[PDB]
Amino acid sequence: IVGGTASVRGEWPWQVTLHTTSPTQRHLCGGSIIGNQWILTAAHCFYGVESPKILRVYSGILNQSEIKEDTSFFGVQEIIIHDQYKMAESGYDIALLKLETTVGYGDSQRPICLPSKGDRNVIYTDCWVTGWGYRKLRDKIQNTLQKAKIPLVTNEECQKRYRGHKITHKMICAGYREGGKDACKGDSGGPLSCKHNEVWHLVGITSWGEGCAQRERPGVYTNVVEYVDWILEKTQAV
Ligand SMILES: COC(=O)Nc1ccc2c(c1)NC(=O)CC/C=C/C[C@H](N1CC[C@H](c3cccc(Cl)c3)CC1=O)c1nc-2c[nH]1
Question: Ranges for the Peptidase S1 domain?
Fold first, then answer.
């Protein structure tokens, strides 16, 4: 996260850190708890991941230093990538992780509400991007979970900023015209959380951008409201 500040413990209890075990254990991506055996994240996170056996999901983490060999984690039973996914820049950058065990909810780990279909017309004015990603283009994964408040940008304005790309309504953009606050490397897959009527909603999934926090280059997020039926298809299968 560029231009953000340290989160307080329990502030984003749906935020997870997804680690890869191959060749050595390291943070891979962010993710969000959406159900008691379900993490919503970005499809591009699994580039070169040939098995869910190398993945570890850690919930209730503020600091990466809380993670050692004896730290409990959730194993991944299945990786579900959207069928239409090819690359982050073309959309459908969405994936689900079916956990091997159930998350026991508490003040440190609980789900974020998905947006409502009727709320496709609501204007969110209180949106935050979170993660352990870089604070600048050439940096390192941060110990403390960072947060940054970012304004949503219309599809029309985002398309103007990304000449040569096709910004679809299945993408949602967020950023300041002058730049300075954004997601960066290692934040992808994490949430863009917006508070509406005292309730947090998972509006976006950190997907891609041209560099980090650049002037007139808003962050591009998977527009979660456009995938609610797809999420229910995969999580509520009979
Ligand atoms: C000790 O452990 C580490 O050092 N671990 C570590 C470091 C870095 C990264 C990473 C793991 N993960 C991967 O390589 C997995 C595949 C992801 C690829 C794209 C991803 N990304 C690309 C840009 C994207 C963005 C920018 C600006 C605005 C938005 Cl709205 C989104 C944010 C982002 O994380 C990214 N993550 C890393 C590099 N690039």
Answer: 1-236
